[PDB]
Amino acid sequence: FKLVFLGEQSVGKTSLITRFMYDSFDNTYQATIGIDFLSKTMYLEDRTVRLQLWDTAGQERFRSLIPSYIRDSTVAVVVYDITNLNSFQQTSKWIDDVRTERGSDVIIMLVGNKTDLADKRQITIEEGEQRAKELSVMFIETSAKTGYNVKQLFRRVASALLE
Ligand SMILES: Nc1nc2c(ncn2[C@@H]2O[C@H](COP(=O)(O)OP(=O)(O)O)[C@@H](O)[C@H]2O)c(=O)[nH]1
Ligand SMILES: [Mg+2]
What we know:
The protein has helices spanning about 15-20, 65-70, 85-90, 90-100, 125-135, 150-160, and strands at about 1-5, 35-45, 45-55, 75-80, 105-115, 140. By secondary structure, the chain is an alpha/beta fold. It has a 6-stranded mixed beta sheet, sandwiched between helices. The PDB classes it as hydrolase.
């Protein structure tokens, strides 16, 4: 169970990890490409599974190494920001990367984060669901700030691993 978070800078990759792990949320920045992995044991389907969470850098000068991390990861979490059109379009790039340096022997979860910022939404939930189905990957919308669906994200991907 190795989960790698991918997506453009500031979609909220770290916040989602931080939310799931310590159930907290900080609104300041963390330019991330440092101190690289977190672990946690979680309950599900009558058992326990320990997950390994990998946090990566979406902003450029640091995508030269990411490939390896993707290659030996069992789950790729591709995140975008529902209020940022560019972050959504770029998910094709990240998804392309995963399959290219990993085959089809992988589980991919597309995540539309920051649902709390409704008055700034640029991508509807239907458009996200439709894109996930067209590319044959999983989909879920979240909010690291409110905690919305954060646990459902991990339970679902974890469930996908056991199945
Ligand atoms: N409103 C809102 N802000 C968020 C959410 N998740 C992250 N952020 C904010 O977006 C900025 C970037 O988040 P960060 O986790 O560093 O993004 P990363 O670069 O993808 O890891 C920070 O200022 C966060 O506080 C969310 O669900 N809702
Ligand atoms: Mg980060």
